[PDB]
């Protein structure tokens, strides 16, 4: 066909890009699932032990 240069780009809406970015963060959590799960267990123990409430009170007051 004849020579053309103009390209009409595909519309990536604000909401579409937001989903792509959030999905990228979701995939990173999925990849580091074990590390997150372990962090949550560790965090749960810090709360059971005196640690998290003590820090909440140290900054609270």
């Amino acid at each position: 066909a004849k020579a053309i240069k103009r390209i009409q780009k595909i519309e990536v809406t604000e909401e579409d890009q937001r989903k792509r970015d959030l999905r990228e963060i979701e995939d990173a959590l999925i990849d580091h699932k074990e590390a997150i799960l372990e962090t949550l267990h560790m965090l749960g123990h810090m709360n059971e032990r005196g640690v998290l409430p003590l820090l909440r009170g140290l900054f609270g007051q």
């Binding site: 390209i7 009409q8 595909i10």
Partner: protein, 975 residues
């Protein structure tokens, strides 16, 4: 034969020419800051001080004699090594934790670490010079320079550019570019050698600056006091070296180092790409690289900007009237399947042509032809080898039977004589030419150059002859006639290994010295010198390129070169052979995998019913029996309503086919046009569908270089956006047509193809892992063929064939066209510059095309640098600025290909092609010149390498350093 005793223990010496070479093989600790195996001994660092028979001597230069008592452990030898290191440390500041060269491979760093050094006797004193950061790609930091001369050895004796020298005669020596000019304004060709071989950060790539380290991003304003604080605090070198080692280890998280094969020319340079995310930090060459070693040119070392270009196509484009619509991959593939099936049903399978890219991999070439023959059912396949070495392979097929070079680049560097015909070897095959230049400069290799333009090879040649364009076969036939008749031909070789001798001598009848002098213009006396040099040389490598093949008699002139080599007995032996230099990075491999209308993979003829039947059983479908169209022929068949579709991958046909006005006219007529590329090329503008392909760095696969050397490339980056690697695209197109191909990696494509192609039978990805390579023919046992025709020639009787060739007069354009427009490439630019114009650094020193006018023609037409002229031929016209230089003579001008519009050389060229291979005769272009403007800025800036002033010399001139008053040899520090 040699027996020595190192450190008390005695052991026999093998072929180790030096004491250091033996110590290294014996795994004995010895510092060698300035020793790099690719460069050889320099004797500048003075850290290899060992005691050869009680005498303290540098082991890198010390020759290993029989019965030598070498000691590398006594307190005096160690006290001498530390003294040599103290001078290195006085010229180099250690700041490793915040240095980009602290990547575990720094020779100063690891030597200070190996030597268990904790203090520095001579405090670091800054050199009285500023950093030379003028060049776009690399920079010089004189304060970090240890004056080892590794960069000087590389520039002078390995690269043979001769820009770098060390001003030893100065109060405080430093590396100088030309006669101490800024790097950017010097003759520095930007090859990268000096940055590669530098043992520290003294010469580094600007890509590495602030990127490699975790703390190197800190602005020099804050980082400088940090270094001064650390220097003052420092308890010992080993303490802060451990901190720097931990940080160096951490860099492995960020920096990715991946082996790849250069996407540019046929030299086949392989190297590691250092990438932090998507940023290319540096192209790090490796000694293990089979074709190049640590050698690179500006394109492979620094021309990779295009991979990250904002112009990279990331989405398929479907034409929607007067514009391109970005569309989903599914709709683009569905449309290609619907239209390809439509033209195949209504007009036949032969109404669809397919173009393979010699930029793409062997597997991608194989899949394009499997799509054309096995899926569509046509033999209309081809690649840019049509405009390239089709005449050279036709010549080799007629005489020696294999469509490839006779040997390796190592054989070229070994040759007694190198005959170069129509080949700008240092600009088109830079790393291959470094082997010839070094051999001629140091080993005394004879170099004969036959060319119409005075290029680097012509300037450095032992004999530079200038024959008239197209007359090359006339002098080639005359050299053979003189050598045969004067009894100087290798009659022993011709006897048992050659055929058609008497018919050959009958065809040489018209080519007498008088006829050659008359037609070529080379006098009879120099013709005698050429014949004597060729005949008396024990081993002769004949390297030819587009100066020979881009002609009407290009196939015949190529055959004449092979015939001459047969006569002089230069085949089947190391250091000799026919070397038609392979163009693209993978032109050899694209042809090797059947991207040719007449042949299937492994060069097995299409019309061969036995070959076709083999592929029918494996592919599960019948193959078309009749051959197809050539790349050049394809536009004629569109113009005659025979070709309704074209699927062109990675080929800029709209600018590289001859007579681009006729090619563009054909494009408007064409029913369906699919262009697959990494950018919206000139050709892609004429496409109905453009598919975003991924370049070499974004895919895996193999490339076959000029030496028939199959090399594997590893993926550096993941494919950008929705661009897919070419094999994945070709496979998805075929699957849309019901192919059902299930490849998961190019290695799956290679396994299928190795079973079918006999010359690739033993090729497996396992045999090509890392820097490993295989030269074809590779039998099923994995045994490759580095040197061809050692045992026999691949013909039924094992004998080569002398092929009768005639001179075909080059096409004459007419009396009105008095300018012979010679055309070619530039060292820095690759063709129209679709890849190299994206490189900002290359564009900075060579921003545009230019027309080389001789000082004679410039005087006659009143041309100055920048004069806009109009070359007009019977096919089109170009408007181009002028550049005066004695590289071009009389009425022959030179127009490089690096332009995509007004000055596109293929607007002048005609559709006339080689009579046997249809290779467009690009070196047979005439035109008339009309002045348009008189005053204009010169098209070649002051910073271009061609505007330099090299300082040729043998070595580093270390004797000048020893002649100084301040020089005291570390070994001599006894009393």
């Amino acid at each position: 034969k040699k027996t020595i005793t190192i450190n008390g223990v005695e052991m026999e010496a093998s072929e180790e020419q030096t004491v250091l070479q033996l110590l290294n093989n014996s795994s004995i600790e010895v510092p060698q800051v300035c020793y790099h195996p690719s460069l050889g001994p320099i004797e500048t660092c003075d850290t290899c001080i060992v005691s050869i028979n009680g005498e303290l001597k540098r082991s890198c230069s010390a020759e290993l004699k029989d019965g030598d008592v070498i000691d590398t452990l006594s307190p005096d030898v160690k006290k001498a090594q530390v003294i040599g290191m103290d001078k290195i440390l006085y010229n180099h500041e250690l700041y490793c934790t915040v240095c980009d060269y602290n990547n575990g491979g720094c020779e100063i760093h690891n030597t200070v670490k190996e030597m268990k050094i904790n203090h520095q006797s001579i405090p670091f004193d800054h050199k009285p010079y500023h950093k030379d950061e003028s060049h776009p790609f690399y920079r010089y930091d004189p304060d970090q320079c240890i004056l080892c001369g590794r960069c000087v050895e590389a520039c002078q004796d390995v690269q043979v550019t001769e820009t770098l020298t060390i001003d030893w005669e100065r109060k405080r020596p430093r590396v100088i570019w030309d006669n101490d000019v800024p790097i950017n304004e010097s003759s520095c060709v930007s090859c990268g050698h000096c940055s590669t071989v530098c043992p520290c950060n003294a010469m580094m790539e600007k890509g590495m600056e602030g990127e490699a380290g975790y703390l190197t991003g800190i602005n020099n304003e804050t980082l400088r006091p940090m270094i001064e604080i650390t220097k003052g605090v420092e308890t010992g070198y080993g303490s802060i070296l451990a901190i720097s080692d931990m940080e160096s280890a951490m860099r492995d998280e960020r920096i990715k180092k991946t082996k790849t094969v250069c996407t540019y020319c046929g030299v086949g340079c392989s190297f590691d790409v250092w990438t932090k995310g998507r940023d290319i930090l540096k192209v790090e060459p490796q000694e293990e690289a089979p074709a190049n070693g640590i050698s690179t040119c500006v394109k492979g070392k620094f021309g990779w900007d295009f991979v990250n270009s904002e112009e990279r196509l990331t989405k398929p484009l479907i034409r929607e009237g007067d514009h391109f619509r970005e569309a989903e991959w599914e709709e683009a593939l569905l449309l290609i399947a619907s239209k390809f099936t439509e033209l195949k049903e209504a007009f036949g399978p032969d109404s669809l042509a397919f173009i393979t890219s010699s930029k793409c991999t062997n597997e991608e070439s194989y899949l394009m032809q499997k799509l054309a023959r096995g899926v569509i059912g046509t033999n209309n396949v081809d690649n840019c080898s049509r405009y390239c070495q089709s005449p050279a392979t036709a010549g080799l097929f007629r005489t020696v039977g294999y469509g490839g070079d006779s040997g390796s680049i190592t054989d070229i560097a070994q040759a007694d004589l190198v005959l170069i015909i129509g080949s700008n070897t240092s600009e088109s095959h830079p790393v291959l030419s470094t082997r010839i230049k070094r051999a001629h400069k140091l080993r005394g290799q004879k170099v004969i150059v036959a060319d119409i333009r005075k290029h680097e090879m012509a300037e450095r040649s032992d004999l530079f002859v200038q024959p008239r364009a197209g007359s090359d076969i006339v002098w080639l036939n005359a050299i053979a006639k003189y050598l045969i008749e004067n009894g100087k031909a290798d009659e022993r070789f011709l006897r048992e290994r050659v055929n058609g001798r008497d018919e050959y001598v009958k065809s040489l009848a018209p080519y007498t010295l008088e006829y050659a002098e008359e037609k070529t213009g080379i006098d009879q006396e120099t013709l005698i010198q050429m014949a004597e040099m060729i005949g008396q040389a024990d081993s002769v490598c004949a390297l030819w390129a587009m100066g020979v093949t881009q002609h009407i008699g290009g196939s015949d002139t190529s055959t004449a070169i092979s015939n001459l080599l047969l006569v002089t007995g230069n085949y089947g032996k190391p250091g000799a052979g026919s070397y038609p230099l392979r163009g693209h990075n993978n032109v050899q491999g694209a042809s090797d995998f059947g991207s040719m209308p007449d042949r299937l993979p492994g060069y097995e003829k299409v019309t061969d019913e036995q070959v076709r039947q083999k592929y029918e059983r494996v592919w599960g479908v019948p193959l078309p029996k009749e051959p197809g169209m050539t790349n050049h022929e394809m536009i004629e068949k569109i113009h005659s309503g025979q070709l309704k579709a074209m699927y062109v991958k990675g080929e800029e046909m709209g600018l590289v086919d001859s007579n681009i006005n006729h090619v563009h006219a054909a494009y408007e007529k064409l029913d369906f046009f699919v262009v697959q590329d990494i950018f919206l090329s000139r050709t892609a503008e004429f496409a109905d569908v453009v598919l975003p392909a991924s370049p070499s760095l974004e895919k895996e696969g193999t490339f076959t270089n000029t030496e028939r050397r199959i090399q594997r490339l590893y993926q550096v980056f993941e494919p950008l956006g929705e661009s897919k690697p070419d094999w994945q695209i070709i496979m998805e197109v075929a699957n849309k047509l019901g192919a059902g191909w299930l490849y998961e990696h190019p290695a799956d494509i290679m396994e299928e193809a190795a079973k079918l192609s006999p010359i690739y039978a033993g090729v497996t990805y396992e045999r090509l892992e890392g820097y490993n390579s295989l030269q074809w023919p590779v039998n099923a046992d994995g045994k490759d063929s580095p040197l061809l025709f050692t045992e026999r020639f691949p013909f039924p009787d094992g004998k080569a064939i002398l092929y009768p060739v005639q001179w075909t007069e080059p096409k004459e354009f007419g009396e009105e066209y008095d300018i012979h427009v010679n055309n070619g490439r530039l060292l820095e630019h690759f063709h129209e510059g679709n890849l190299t114009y994206k490189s900002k650094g290359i564009s900075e020193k060579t921003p545009e095309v230019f027309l080389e006018i001789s000082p004679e023609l410039a005087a006659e037409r009143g041309i100055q640098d920048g004069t806009l002229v109009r070359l007009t031929s019977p096919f089109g016209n170009v408007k181009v600025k002028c550049l005066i230089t004695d590289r071009v003579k009389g009425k022959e001008v030179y127009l490089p290909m690096n332009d995509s519009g007004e000055a596109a050389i293929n607007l002048l060229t005609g559709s006339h092609a080689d009579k046997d291979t249809d290779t467009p005769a690009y070196k047979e272009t005439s035109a008339k010149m009309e002045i348009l403007k008189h005053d204009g800025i010169s098209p070649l800036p002051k910073i271009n390498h061609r505007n330099g002033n090299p300082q040729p010399q043998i070595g580093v001139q270390v004797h000048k350093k020893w002649a100084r008053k301040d020089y005291i040899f570390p070994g001599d520090a006894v009393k």
